[PDB]
C-alpha cells in the first residue's frame, strides 16, 4: 500500500549513514535496519 519513507512508526527513527544511504533505527530493541518497515506490512 502506501509506503513513501518519510514518516515512521512509533519507536522507529531514520538516519543517514556516512555512505549516504538512510537507515532506520528502532528505539524499542536498539536495532538498526536498511530495510523499509512501511513497504512491508506487519499483520
Amino acid at each position: 500500500g502506501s509506503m513513501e519513507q518519510g514518516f515512521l512508526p512509533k519507536g522507529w527513527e531514520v538516519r543517514h549513514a556516512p555512505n549516504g544511504r538512510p537507515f532506520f533505527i528502532d528505539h524499542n530493541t536498539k536495532t538498526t535496519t536498511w530495510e523499509d518497515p512501511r513497504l512491508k506490512i506487519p499483520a
Binding site: 538516519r15 549513514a17 555512505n19 537507515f23 533505527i25 528505539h27 536498539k30 538498526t32 535496519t33 536498511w34
Partner: peptide, 11 residues
C-alpha cells in the same frame, strides 16, 4: 557492505 552505527553510538 557496512553496518549502521548503533543508537548509543549516534547519541
Amino acid at each position: 557492505t557496512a553496518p549502521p552505527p548503533a543508537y548509543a553510538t549516534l547519541g
